[PDB]
Amino acid sequence: EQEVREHQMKKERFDRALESKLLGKRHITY
Amino acid sequence: MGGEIITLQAGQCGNHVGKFLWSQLAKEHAIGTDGLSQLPDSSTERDDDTKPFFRENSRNKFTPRAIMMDSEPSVIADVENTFRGFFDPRNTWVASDGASAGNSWANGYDIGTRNQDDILNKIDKEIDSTDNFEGFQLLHSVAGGTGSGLGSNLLEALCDRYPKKILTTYSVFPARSSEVVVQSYNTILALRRLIEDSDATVVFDNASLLNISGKVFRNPNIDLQHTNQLISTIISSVTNSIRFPSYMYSSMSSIYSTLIPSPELHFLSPSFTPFTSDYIHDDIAHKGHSSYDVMLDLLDPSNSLVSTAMNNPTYFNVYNTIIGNVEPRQISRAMTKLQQRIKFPSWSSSAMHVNIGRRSPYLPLQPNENEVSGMMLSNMSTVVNVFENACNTFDKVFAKGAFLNNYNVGDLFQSMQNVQDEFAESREVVQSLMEDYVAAEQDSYLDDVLVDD
Amino acid sequence: GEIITLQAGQCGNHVGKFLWSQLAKEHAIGTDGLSQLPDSSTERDDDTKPFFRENSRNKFTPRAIMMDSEPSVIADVENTFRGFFDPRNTWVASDGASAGNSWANGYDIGTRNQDDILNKIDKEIDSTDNFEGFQLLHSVAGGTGSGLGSNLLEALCDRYPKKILTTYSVFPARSSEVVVQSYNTILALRRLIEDSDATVVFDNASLLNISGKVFRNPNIDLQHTNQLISTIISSVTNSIRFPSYMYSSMSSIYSTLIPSPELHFLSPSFTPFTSKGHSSYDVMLDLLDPSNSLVSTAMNNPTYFNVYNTIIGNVEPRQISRAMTKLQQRIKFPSWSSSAMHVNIGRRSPYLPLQPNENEVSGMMLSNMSTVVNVFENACNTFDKVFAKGAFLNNYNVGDLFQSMQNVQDEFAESREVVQSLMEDYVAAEQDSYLDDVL
Amino acid sequence: NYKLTRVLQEAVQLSSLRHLMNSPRNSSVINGLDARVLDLGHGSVGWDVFTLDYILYPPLSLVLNVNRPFGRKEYLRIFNFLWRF
Ligand SMILES: Nc1nc2c(ncn2[C@@H]2O[C@H](COP(=O)(O)OP(=O)(O)OP(=O)(O)O)[C@@H](O)[C@H]2O)c(=O)[nH]1
Ligand SMILES: Nc1nc2c(ncn2[C@@H]2O[C@H](COP(=O)(O)OP(=O)(O)OP(=O)(O)O)[C@@H](O)[C@H]2O)c(=O)[nH]1
């Protein structure tokens, strides 16, 4: 379980870091 | 521990037996004659396993892992024309040497030694094509001199070419020989190599074959094609435990572990109930037998495929495989009835072995009378009794040295003295085999290790 | 990047005609040269520029020049391909039919009419800008063909010292004319040693054998041999004619195949083909097997130096890996050279009619082993025997070779010496002690 | 253990279960098998250190019983006995 878990976790970490570096499309307004 | 097995067709009888066996396997696994599997490649779920015996070149074509080798191109061309695309044309060996110049074992040995590189290259190509392998199955057909010589050459090559593989052989013995001298000479020269290098050997005496083909078939005349059909059905039944893998016996090595007590005792006796996949198989639903009656018929001398000559026969390893819907209570009843009726040696407490296989989901289902069939293989010393006729012919003809002008050519020895010495050595080898068998028939065989430690 | 085809002799003319017909059928150019593709879609994945010049009429003229002393075969090719070839790219030397099957007359005709060929190749080069080299196709047995090939090779090496030259040399079979054709073969071989950059060997005997094996009719035709030459050239040039990601020029292929200019002779093989049935593993096994090579191996275990294969068809990586492992297990490589095995997946031409035995993945393979040295040894041995036994070569010469026969014998001895040093270099590279200068 | 799971996948490919691997639904059924090894023993043999850990997914877990960490390990002991034999 740890193998696929750490694989998916590394993939998700890379994806989140890239999405945060790319202008951060997530926003909140008022 | 299960590996792939490559079929070796040698001689005319061997090629006919191989063709019949491959047609039977095609009918069982729904492969047909055209080579292309009759079942669509979409239904991938298959309870059987053709991979050990068939090469999966494509998803819909199962090419049999078999090599045919013969000196007469007529039978090879006939088989190739009948089975269009089924066999591999690159696995057909003829050497373009023409017809066999006699029925001498020396001629076959010479025609095998001269073209040994071609057959070895074909075997190497098949080994490169396959990924897994366990051993070969050689069809000797010792009745023919050239076929027996080719089989002996194949054995003498494979023994020291692939020692990590177990070698099984199938030697077909004739009922009444036209030229008893030459046929006994060929059988003895093949038996020498069988004792030397072969790991397992199954004998097929033609007398019981003719008897069964006259009894169960309606036509009084017996034809060699449906005679070899019986041997091919026997081979398919004994390879069923690997083709449709059972739960207890799933490898030829595991089967021969319980079928072979020692490398010296490597000769079995087969028996089978009235067949159901042969030509005239309509007279089987009138018997109405159970598994107990199937075991009784298997142990009966009328269903054995070799000359029984049962005069208080000593059994060493009795094994049976029952295919169909078998009942465990009936199996236990048959075992209890047979353990009180089969002679067992007092030095070994090992009893007979029973295995239950599965029926093919595509084979024609038989009525409840003969829906279940059985095969039995017994280690009996009566094989030396079958050989005794050839040994007596040798002892009564070797006094003069007749037919010596035929075994002198081809082989590595052209003089008469060398051929006489080789024949005497082969006779001594078969005599020592018979002595070992008649000694293992006694209790002192196991006491030999008890008296000295 | 543009390569100019050179058709020398009647054999060269035939193989060029066959190759151009095959390329037209592949790229949908046809016999008339006009674009057989509709004018609605211009997106193409092939590369016809290095082989076909597209004019204003959208017609693709083949970038090929024919040098031969026999105008009959050239006129026949023009008749069969009316509207395909350019009449200005035709060279017949204006000397009538051919005469004499020796290298001397061919080289003399080349040296005499070199100005016309020079002007033709200069115009063909100036027609475009991007150039990489030329392509020669000839038989070393033919006298006039070998002479013209040697003359054009000398002209190319002393005029353009930057363009890489590749040739396809068809060696003769075991026949009668080898007593005199061996002279032309060894002279062309010496010229290749001196100036040529790459050579692909072909044995006529093995070619006819493979032809009779693959064909039902045992009466093999020279036209069938030329068609098989066309097929092998198409399979070896597919990597350049359909570049997708890796291979877009013959320079990289020759760099990964030829390790040193002293070893620039390659043996081709191609299987299966006609003129799903076999997986890629079986295709590579047949390629390794000598029964599918276009040259007589005559060796039990040749010393493989550099091999490179191009597989045409839909292939999956597991069979590639299995075949690569089996090749690494069987094929022996020298302990001083690398065991480089290159596999290139070449795409199929969608504008090409479907070849018989459809969906059958095929494979070509170029090897550098000890199979060329056997043919070279046989050729030089036959030459030495005929030279030291019969002094008849001094009776058929032209020009300077006819003014004095001593210079001819000196040149032949020099060719024997250079091919002897060549085969000695090969047999030395076969051993591990070849690279002992650095270790 | 990456070479171990690669060997497991190669054995699945080589066995008769290659038909189930070709069939897409049975391919997912086979992929549901967890190639998880519970180490048993200190420096013991590769046979004894081997262990099979299987994880179910709904809605099959609500019906089928497996070697749950809070169960009786019936399948575990049966597999251990058969593995010894
Ligand atoms: N029962 C049976 N015996 C056969 C069959 N085919 C051949 N035989 C045996 O073969 C013997 C005759 O010799 P051939 O079959 O010609 O063998 P050969 O002389 O070596 O010739 P080739 O096999 O062609 O090399 C007979 O005594 C048979 O016992 C067959 O189909 N059925
Ligand atoms: N394979 C093949 N070889 C050919 C063909 N035509 C000619 N050849 C070669 O030509 C050689 C015979 O000599 P010729 O045909 O007279 O060639 P040549 O000596 O250069 O004379 P010309 O062709 O007239 O210039 C053979 O050894 C072949 O290698 C052909 O159509 N196919």
Tab-separated table of N, CA and C and ligand atoms in Angstrom, chain B residues 10-17 20 69-75 98-104 108 111 140-150 172-179 183 186 204-206 209-210 222-229 231, ligand 1:
chain	number	residue	atom	x	y	z
B	10	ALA	N	8.865	-39.649	-35.119
B	10	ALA	CA	9.958	-40.358	-35.774
B	10	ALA	C	9.422	-41.613	-36.444
B	11	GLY	N	9.791	-41.812	-37.706
B	11	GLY	CA	9.328	-42.952	-38.467
B	11	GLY	C	7.913	-42.760	-38.982
B	12	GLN	N	7.478	-43.712	-39.810
B	12	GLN	CA	6.130	-43.648	-40.365
B	12	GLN	C	5.079	-43.835	-39.278
B	13	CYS	N	5.258	-44.850	-38.429
B	13	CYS	CA	4.323	-45.070	-37.331
B	13	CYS	C	4.324	-43.892	-36.368
B	14	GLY	N	5.505	-43.347	-36.069
B	14	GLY	CA	5.574	-42.189	-35.193
B	14	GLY	C	4.878	-40.976	-35.778
B	15	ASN	N	5.051	-40.746	-37.082
B	15	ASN	CA	4.389	-39.617	-37.726
B	15	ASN	C	2.877	-39.800	-37.740
B	16	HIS	N	2.408	-41.025	-37.991
B	16	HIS	CA	0.970	-41.280	-37.963
B	16	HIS	C	0.402	-41.074	-36.565
B	17	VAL	N	1.107	-41.563	-35.542
B	17	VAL	CA	0.650	-41.393	-34.165
B	17	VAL	C	0.629	-39.917	-33.792
B	20	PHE	N	-2.377	-38.249	-35.525
B	20	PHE	CA	-3.627	-38.599	-34.854
B	20	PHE	C	-3.747	-37.898	-33.505
B	69	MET	N	10.118	-35.966	-38.211
B	69	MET	CA	11.378	-36.346	-38.838
B	69	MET	C	11.207	-37.731	-39.439
B	70	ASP	N	11.455	-37.853	-40.740
B	70	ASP	CA	11.260	-39.131	-41.409
B	70	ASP	C	12.098	-39.165	-42.676
B	71	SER	N	12.370	-40.382	-43.146
B	71	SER	CA	13.104	-40.580	-44.386
B	71	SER	C	12.194	-40.699	-45.599
B	72	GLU	N	10.923	-41.046	-45.398
B	72	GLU	CA	9.973	-41.150	-46.490
B	72	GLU	C	9.189	-39.851	-46.592
B	73	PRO	N	9.415	-39.026	-47.619
B	73	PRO	CA	8.682	-37.754	-47.717
B	73	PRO	C	7.216	-37.913	-48.073
B	74	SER	N	6.778	-39.108	-48.477
B	74	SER	CA	5.393	-39.291	-48.896
B	74	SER	C	4.426	-39.064	-47.740
B	75	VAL	N	4.691	-39.694	-46.593
B	75	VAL	CA	3.796	-39.548	-45.448
B	75	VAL	C	3.831	-38.118	-44.920
B	98	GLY	N	16.071	-39.687	-49.802
B	98	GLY	CA	15.335	-40.740	-50.465
B	98	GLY	C	14.744	-41.737	-49.486
B	99	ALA	N	14.197	-42.811	-50.053
B	99	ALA	CA	13.589	-43.856	-49.246
B	99	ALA	C	14.652	-44.610	-48.449
B	100	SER	N	14.203	-45.265	-47.379
B	100	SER	CA	15.110	-46.019	-46.526
B	100	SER	C	15.624	-47.252	-47.260
B	101	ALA	N	16.938	-47.468	-47.197
B	101	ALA	CA	17.566	-48.616	-47.851
B	101	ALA	C	17.562	-49.811	-46.898
B	102	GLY	N	16.359	-50.298	-46.627
B	102	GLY	CA	16.156	-51.436	-45.753
B	102	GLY	C	15.555	-51.019	-44.419
B	103	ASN	N	15.254	-52.037	-43.616
B	103	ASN	CA	14.669	-51.868	-42.290
B	103	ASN	C	15.697	-52.133	-41.194
B	104	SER	N	16.939	-51.714	-41.428
B	104	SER	CA	18.020	-51.935	-40.479
B	104	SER	C	18.147	-50.754	-39.529
B	108	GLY	N	19.010	-46.308	-39.942
B	108	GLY	CA	18.406	-45.193	-39.234
B	108	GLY	C	19.409	-44.423	-38.394
B	111	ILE	N	21.410	-42.304	-40.862
B	111	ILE	CA	20.647	-41.180	-41.387
B	111	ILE	C	20.357	-40.152	-40.302
B	140	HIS	N	9.179	-43.605	-30.658
B	140	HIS	CA	10.251	-44.436	-31.199
B	140	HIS	C	9.799	-45.189	-32.443
B	141	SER	N	8.688	-45.917	-32.345
B	141	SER	CA	8.228	-46.819	-33.399
B	141	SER	C	9.332	-47.812	-33.765
B	142	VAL	N	9.722	-48.608	-32.764
B	142	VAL	CA	10.844	-49.532	-32.901
B	142	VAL	C	10.588	-50.644	-33.903
B	143	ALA	N	9.347	-50.801	-34.372
B	143	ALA	CA	9.062	-51.831	-35.364
B	143	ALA	C	9.781	-51.555	-36.678
B	144	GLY	N	9.995	-50.285	-37.010
B	144	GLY	CA	10.750	-49.925	-38.194
B	144	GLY	C	12.212	-49.676	-37.850
B	145	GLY	N	13.099	-50.228	-38.682
B	145	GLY	CA	14.523	-50.107	-38.410
B	145	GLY	C	15.016	-48.675	-38.503
B	146	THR	N	14.631	-47.973	-39.570
B	146	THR	CA	15.055	-46.586	-39.734
B	146	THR	C	14.472	-45.699	-38.641
B	147	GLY	N	13.202	-45.914	-38.288
B	147	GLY	CA	12.605	-45.142	-37.211
B	147	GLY	C	13.280	-45.388	-35.874
B	148	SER	N	13.596	-46.652	-35.576
B	148	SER	CA	14.282	-46.965	-34.327
B	148	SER	C	15.679	-46.361	-34.298
B	149	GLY	N	16.389	-46.399	-35.430
B	149	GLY	CA	17.701	-45.777	-35.484
B	149	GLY	C	17.639	-44.273	-35.303
B	150	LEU	N	16.648	-43.628	-35.925
B	150	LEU	CA	16.483	-42.188	-35.757
B	150	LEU	C	16.144	-41.837	-34.315
B	172	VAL	N	6.500	-48.530	-29.719
B	172	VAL	CA	5.397	-49.362	-30.184
B	172	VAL	C	5.971	-50.692	-30.655
B	173	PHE	N	5.571	-51.776	-29.994
B	173	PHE	CA	6.045	-53.098	-30.377
B	173	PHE	C	4.990	-53.835	-31.192
B	174	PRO	N	5.403	-54.558	-32.227
B	174	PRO	CA	4.437	-55.269	-33.068
B	174	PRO	C	3.943	-56.549	-32.411
B	175	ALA	N	2.813	-57.039	-32.930
B	175	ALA	CA	2.237	-58.281	-32.426
B	175	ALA	C	2.984	-59.491	-32.974
B	176	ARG	N	2.961	-59.666	-34.292
B	176	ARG	CA	3.689	-60.730	-34.967
B	176	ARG	C	4.559	-60.098	-36.043
B	177	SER	N	5.868	-60.303	-35.940
B	177	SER	CA	6.818	-59.681	-36.851
B	177	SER	C	6.978	-60.533	-38.103
B	178	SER	N	6.988	-59.872	-39.265
B	178	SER	CA	7.208	-60.586	-40.517
B	178	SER	C	8.625	-61.143	-40.590
B	179	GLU	N	9.622	-60.308	-40.317
B	179	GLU	CA	11.017	-60.735	-40.221
B	179	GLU	C	11.438	-60.570	-38.765
B	183	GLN	N	13.511	-57.462	-36.899
B	183	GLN	CA	12.709	-56.639	-36.001
B	183	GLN	C	13.188	-56.764	-34.558
B	186	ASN	N	16.400	-54.729	-34.260
B	186	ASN	CA	16.123	-53.299	-34.147
B	186	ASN	C	15.570	-52.949	-32.769
B	204	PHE	N	4.101	-50.296	-26.123
B	204	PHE	CA	2.801	-50.479	-26.776
B	204	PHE	C	2.891	-51.736	-27.642
B	205	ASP	N	2.405	-52.853	-27.108
B	205	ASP	CA	2.382	-54.103	-27.854
B	205	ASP	C	1.155	-54.138	-28.760
B	206	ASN	N	1.367	-54.487	-30.029
B	206	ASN	CA	0.298	-54.435	-31.018
B	206	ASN	C	-0.706	-55.572	-30.889
B	209	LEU	N	-3.578	-54.222	-29.001
B	209	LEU	CA	-4.173	-53.203	-29.861
B	209	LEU	C	-5.077	-53.838	-30.912
B	210	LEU	N	-4.587	-54.888	-31.575
B	210	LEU	CA	-5.402	-55.598	-32.555
B	210	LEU	C	-6.614	-56.241	-31.899
B	222	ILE	N	-8.754	-54.677	-39.578
B	222	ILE	CA	-8.132	-53.660	-38.736
B	222	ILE	C	-7.205	-52.826	-39.606
B	223	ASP	N	-7.327	-51.505	-39.501
B	223	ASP	CA	-6.497	-50.575	-40.250
B	223	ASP	C	-5.501	-49.888	-39.325
B	224	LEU	N	-4.309	-49.625	-39.866
B	224	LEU	CA	-3.234	-49.050	-39.063
B	224	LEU	C	-3.572	-47.645	-38.583
B	225	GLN	N	-4.397	-46.908	-39.327
B	225	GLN	CA	-4.719	-45.541	-38.928
B	225	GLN	C	-5.556	-45.520	-37.652
B	226	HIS	N	-6.666	-46.261	-37.622
B	226	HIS	CA	-7.430	-46.313	-36.382
B	226	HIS	C	-6.795	-47.233	-35.348
B	227	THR	N	-5.746	-47.976	-35.716
B	227	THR	CA	-4.938	-48.651	-34.707
B	227	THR	C	-4.059	-47.655	-33.954
B	228	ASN	N	-3.366	-46.777	-34.685
B	228	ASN	CA	-2.603	-45.705	-34.054
B	228	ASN	C	-3.508	-44.682	-33.383
B	229	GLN	N	-4.779	-44.615	-33.790
B	229	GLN	CA	-5.730	-43.751	-33.097
B	229	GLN	C	-5.819	-44.106	-31.618
B	231	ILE	N	-3.376	-45.403	-29.711
B	231	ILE	CA	-2.172	-44.916	-29.043
B	231	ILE	C	-2.228	-43.402	-28.885
E	1	LIG	N1	0.322	-50.765	-35.791
E	1	LIG	C1	0.946	-49.979	-36.663
E	1	LIG	N2	2.255	-50.240	-37.014
E	1	LIG	C2	2.902	-49.446	-37.904
E	1	LIG	C3	2.247	-48.359	-38.467
E	1	LIG	N3	3.106	-47.743	-39.307
E	1	LIG	C4	4.283	-48.405	-39.288
E	1	LIG	N4	4.172	-49.470	-38.432
E	1	LIG	C5	5.248	-50.434	-38.130
E	1	LIG	O1	6.277	-50.280	-39.090
E	1	LIG	C6	6.712	-51.526	-39.592
E	1	LIG	C7	6.992	-51.416	-41.088
E	1	LIG	O2	8.118	-50.608	-41.351
E	1	LIG	P1	7.957	-49.066	-41.793
E	1	LIG	O3	6.656	-48.512	-41.268
E	1	LIG	O4	8.037	-48.924	-43.292
E	1	LIG	O5	9.189	-48.312	-41.078
E	1	LIG	P2	10.563	-48.098	-41.889
E	1	LIG	O6	10.940	-49.375	-42.599
E	1	LIG	O7	11.672	-47.636	-40.974
E	1	LIG	O8	10.203	-46.969	-42.979
E	1	LIG	P3	9.990	-45.435	-42.536
E	1	LIG	O9	9.135	-45.409	-41.292
E	1	LIG	O10	9.305	-44.675	-43.647
E	1	LIG	O11	11.330	-44.803	-42.245
E	1	LIG	C8	5.599	-52.520	-39.314
E	1	LIG	O12	6.127	-53.726	-38.809
E	1	LIG	C9	4.723	-51.855	-38.274
E	1	LIG	O13	4.800	-52.545	-37.046
E	1	LIG	C10	0.932	-48.090	-38.119
E	1	LIG	O14	0.350	-47.126	-38.615
E	1	LIG	N5	0.280	-48.903	-37.215
